[PDB]
Amino acid sequence: QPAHLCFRSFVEALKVDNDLVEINTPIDPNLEAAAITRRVCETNDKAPLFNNLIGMKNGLFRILGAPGSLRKSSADRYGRLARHLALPPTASMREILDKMLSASDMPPIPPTIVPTGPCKENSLDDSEFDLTELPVPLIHKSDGGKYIQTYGMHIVQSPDGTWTNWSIARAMVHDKNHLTGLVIPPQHIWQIHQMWKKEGRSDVPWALAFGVPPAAIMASSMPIPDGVTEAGYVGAMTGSSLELVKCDTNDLYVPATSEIVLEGTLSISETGPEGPFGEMHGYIFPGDTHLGAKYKVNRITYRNNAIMPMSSCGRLTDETHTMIGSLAAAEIRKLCQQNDLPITDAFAPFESQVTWVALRVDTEKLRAMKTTSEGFRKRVGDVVFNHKAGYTIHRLVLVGDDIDVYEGKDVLWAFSTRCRPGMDETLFEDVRGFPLIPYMGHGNGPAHRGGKVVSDALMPTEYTTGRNWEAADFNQSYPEDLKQKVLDNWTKMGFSHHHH
Amino acid sequence: QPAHLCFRSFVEALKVDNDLVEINTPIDPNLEAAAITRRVCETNDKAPLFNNLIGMKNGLFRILGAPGSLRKSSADRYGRLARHLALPPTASMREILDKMLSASDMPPIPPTIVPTGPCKENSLDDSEFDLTELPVPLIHKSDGGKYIQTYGMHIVQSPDGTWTNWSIARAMVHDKNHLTGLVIPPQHIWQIHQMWKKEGRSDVPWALAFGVPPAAIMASSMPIPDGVTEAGYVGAMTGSSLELVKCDTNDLYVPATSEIVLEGTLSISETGPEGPFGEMHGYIFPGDTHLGAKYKVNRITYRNNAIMPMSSCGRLTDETHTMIGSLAAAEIRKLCQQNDLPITDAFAPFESQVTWVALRVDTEKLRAMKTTSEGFRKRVGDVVFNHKAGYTIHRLVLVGDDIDVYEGKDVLWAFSTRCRPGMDETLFEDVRGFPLIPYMGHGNGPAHRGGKVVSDALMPTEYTTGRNWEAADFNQSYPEDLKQKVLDNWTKMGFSHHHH
Numbered sequence A, B: 001q002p003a004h005l006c007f008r009s010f011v012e013a014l015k016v017d018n019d020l021v022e023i024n025t026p027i028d029p030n031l032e033a034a035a036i037t038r039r040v041c042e043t044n045d046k047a048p049l050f051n052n053l054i055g056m057k058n059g060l061f062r063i064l065g066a067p068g069s070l071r072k073s074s075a076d077r078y079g080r081l082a083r084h085l086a087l088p089p090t091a092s093m094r095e096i097l098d099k100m101l102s103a104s105d106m107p108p109i110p111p112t113i114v115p116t117g118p119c120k121e122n123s124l125d126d127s128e129f130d131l132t133e134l135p136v137p138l139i140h141k142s143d144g145g146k147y148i149q150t151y152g153m154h155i156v157q158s159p160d161g162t163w164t165n166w167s168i169a170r171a172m173v174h175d176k177n178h179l180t181g182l183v184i185p186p187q188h189i190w191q192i193h194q195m196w197k198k199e200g201r202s203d204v205p206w207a208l209a210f211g212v213p214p215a216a217i218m219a220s221s222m223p224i225p226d227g228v229t230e231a232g233y234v235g236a237m238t239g240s241s242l243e244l245v246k247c248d249t250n251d252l253y254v255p256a257t258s259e260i261v262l263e264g265t266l267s268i269s270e271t272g273p274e275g276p277f278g279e280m281h282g283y284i285f286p287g288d289t290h291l292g293a294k295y296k297v298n299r300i301t302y303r304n305n306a307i308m309p310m311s312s313c314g315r316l317t318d319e320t321h322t323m324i325g326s327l328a329a330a331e332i333r334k335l336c337q338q339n340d341l342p343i344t345d346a347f348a349p350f351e352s353q354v355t356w357v358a359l360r361v362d363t364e365k366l367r368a369m370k371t372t373s374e375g376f377r378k379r380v381g382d383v384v385f386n387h388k389a390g391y392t393i394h395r396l397v398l399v400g401d402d403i404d405v406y407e408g409k410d411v412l413w414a415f416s417t418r419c420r421p422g423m424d425e426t427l428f429e430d431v432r433g434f435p436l437i438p439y440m441g442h443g444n445g446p447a448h449r450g451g452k453v454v455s456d457a458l459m460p461t462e463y464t465t466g467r468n469w470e471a472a473d474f475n476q477s478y479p480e481d482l483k484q485k486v487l488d489n490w491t492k493m494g495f496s497h498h499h500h
């Protein structure tokens, strides 16, 4: 099975890439696995595969940390993400985001039901498992629970059966047969949960599949449109219908090669203590527990020698940055284009803790619009900040054609030198805010509203007659023949490889 | 003579450090020298010494590029700056800034007059030189002139003789015996020029000394207080009285070991075309010429085999960042402390193009003040933005004790995650602005006023009861014994030197 379509094959691909460290000696899921993983993410090291996890019983479970984090070399920096998508390991961010957007103007390819798969190799009923007895990790020392769910896919369906959503949302073990987790607006798991609650008849049939096809976990992390079933979007992107098997205890379908599947229900009435958790912006607020959604687990099914992927998230760089940020940026780029805004590229700078998105403007198009900064700022912020795709993003930075938004150094240069504080910005206080950013949920203002800004780093002539500067850099401040001479004589004179 | 007290010894020190590349083949001062230097600055390579400059005649002149730029290794990153000050090459930024501030509560050590020095080894009178015949560099392709003066020290004295100012301000060749340059408020060369213009009697006696003692060029770049003679401040900092020789044609005094000295006058009535120039924020606006101050040169004196230092300034990283930014930050730190504000450290992040200063707050002190963000923001901005030391700085970022302001990654993390846009900021529109920032002088608003902001990245509890988070990082999210275990087993498990 191809690496993008089968987690187990993905792990083999990382090994073959020399991007995997197999640790076969005992590792404690209480902090140790996650501390190793954290150190890997902070240093862009190889992904750790913990094959000897203290507390693993009857096949549950090995852990793979850092599945979507960065490689050390610049040439294959995003290779782990490329391996989720059948792309070359040297793929650029633009090529990864284009791949993730490609299914947006293709017919869906619905999934294929198959009678069985590797996820059915083992099962545990209601009398045979205890979630508190599994080697679920404690990921950060002050976490409010053991976060089983950091890289699996929740599967829920609208009451009318017409939309089946796949998404990532955190969850922790509550007791032997329940989880608690985040289910918050405007997320699709929340939107679907609301539909079931308004019907008022039953709890939401649910499954959570870990170690799903890598292309599916990528779509699970992306804010594709309301009402779009992720399975058909992944089918179109990959050009292949995904193979799904029915759950044993409900009529939901899970990827045939899922490593581990939990089947049960998401309550429309019950809650339980959830959090705190060491989160994407780099913080944990110890003791900040709140009531979260409550899931009941009725059945576990799993592969022989099952592997649980884990995100040890926090400070740069992990899956919450590489996937949340970048995939929101990709959808925002599309959204802008669909609203007739002249945006060519979008990325969420890592340096912003993925709270900014830099939007590259086609300034020839902009000049034809005969508009102004104030007008344009307002139009861009109204489009993005009133849409779900803008949820996580609190600052939009508009930049001209000379800036590569995928290079944080260039975005910071443009921001710092072309956007006059206050005058060149529009604040948005009557939009939904992302409460997990510390300045929102633990800040001075409403946790769920406002705190957003569009910062215009377009210069005045970019709206009128064209760029009227050249950079004071080696590239722009010297003619071609001189530059080349300098480069050709560099080592000869006495001054100091691409892959590495 | 010690390296901090003699430019020629400083060049030898860079050689001995293996931080110098001597280029003994012909190099063109038209762009080539500056392109090499630019490439060095963008890659933190060794300083270039051009010993064979096309057009050099009768000893005028060799060029040293990148005298105050960065080294590649982290361990001696600031070694070229340390060599200006007799510090170890591994000195931290805090240690360099502390050294530059040390004379602020010491009695000045006035300079010593000596009858002669190496700067008197050669002379050229009014009939013997032509500035257009010297190998003055063209530094950027669109510059409006050949910028002779990028790393020399202008020397002017108040009419009453009580204050002698040393400072760096750019100047270019106008014709055979004149320069034009920037002389703008609130700079001390401007303040002194205004005193002479109000007297109305004569042009300002002036000298410009290139290749001055390195400790003197550092003070020349620092906004030490109005009315303080830099020579006595440098004396106190170094613990030694500087040796000066009188000019031949006026009664100003220049460092005895200056490589090259121009003597003449700064006009109180005449102006000439000046600029454009590839400037510190990374831009040049071709054709943006304006009338600047006009200097007449009456005499040149110089050392045998004179060396002209040059800054090929622009995009990161050069003397305009390492010296302008950092030395303004140092003075702002002091200014804050003198105004009873609880600031421990200040630095201008390179990532901000040195337009921000991050101010580290002693939050124990802050809590005792029983104040609020709004109150505190306003007080800090009124102190700094109404003072000359804040001139170049458009954004102040207040950060708590956990942030190392000398680490741009940590400043950006704090800014991005702890400062709510708008609510946690105070804009300042009625303060002097720095027109050279593109968003000021080429922006949408008044070039010389406003555009400043204080961004408070202190969290709410930092004002009241104390920090209420831990970082979700390896350092903070795992206990000490575990961290150490992980570090000790890192290479054994299969994962990947200080100097490099």
Ligand SMILES: Cc1cc2c3c(c1C)C(C)(C)C[C@H]1C[C@@H](C)[C@]4(C(=O)NC(=O)N=C4N2C[C@H](O)[C@H](O)[C@H](O)COP(=O)(O)O)N31
Pocket (backbone or CB within 6 Å): A149, A150, A151, A165, A166, A167, A168, A169, A170, A171, A182, A184, A186, A187, A188, A189, A220, A221, A222, A223, A224, A279, A280, A311, A313, A319, A320, A323, A324, A436
């Ligand atoms: C890649 C990734 C994406 C995450 C999360 C994580 C990782 C690794 C972990 C679990 C580590 C941390 C948490 C923290 C949190 C941010 C959250 C979450 O708990 N709640 C949430 O609502 N959104 C999350 N997302 C983003 C989410 O997947 C996207 O917003 C996606 O568009 C949702 O799919 P729908 O569009 O179909 O609604 N988590």
Ligand SMILES: Cc1cc2c3c(c1C)C(C)(C)C[C@H]1C[C@@H](C)[C@]4(C(=O)NC(=O)N=C4N2C[C@H](O)[C@H](O)[C@H](O)COP(=O)(O)O)N31
Pocket (backbone or CB within 6 Å): B149, B150, B151, B165, B166, B167, B168, B169, B170, B171, B182, B184, B186, B187, B188, B189, B220, B221, B222, B223, B224, B279, B280, B311, B313, B319, B320, B323, B324, B436
């Ligand atoms: C280290 C350095 C410092 C510079 C400049 C440069 C370098 C290398 C160059 C020449 C390359 C570029 C220009 C551009 C420009 C910024 C300027 C200038 O032309 N005008 C100005 O007014 N201030 C400049 N400074 C800063 C100045 O030295 C400090 O502000 C100092 O406090 C002044 O001394 P006083 O306090 O005693 O007034 N230049």
Ligand SMILES: [K+]
Pocket (backbone or CB within 6 Å): A166, A167, A168, A219, A220, A221, A222, A223, A224, A230
């Ligand atoms: K999704």
Ligand SMILES: [K+]
Pocket (backbone or CB within 6 Å): A418, A419, A420, A424, A456, A457, A458, A459, A460, B439
């Ligand atoms: K702007």
Ligand SMILES: [K+]
Pocket (backbone or CB within 6 Å): B166, B167, B168, B219, B220, B221, B222, B223, B224, B230
């Ligand atoms: K000075």
Ligand SMILES: [K+]
Pocket (backbone or CB within 6 Å): A439, B418, B419, B420, B424, B456, B457, B458, B459, B460
């Ligand atoms: K704040």
Ligand SMILES: [Mn+2]
Pocket (backbone or CB within 6 Å): A165, A166, A167, A188, A223, A224, A225, A228, A230
């Ligand atoms: Mn969805």
Ligand SMILES: [Mn+2]
Pocket (backbone or CB within 6 Å): B165, B166, B167, B188, B223, B224, B225, B228, B230
């Ligand atoms: Mn001064």
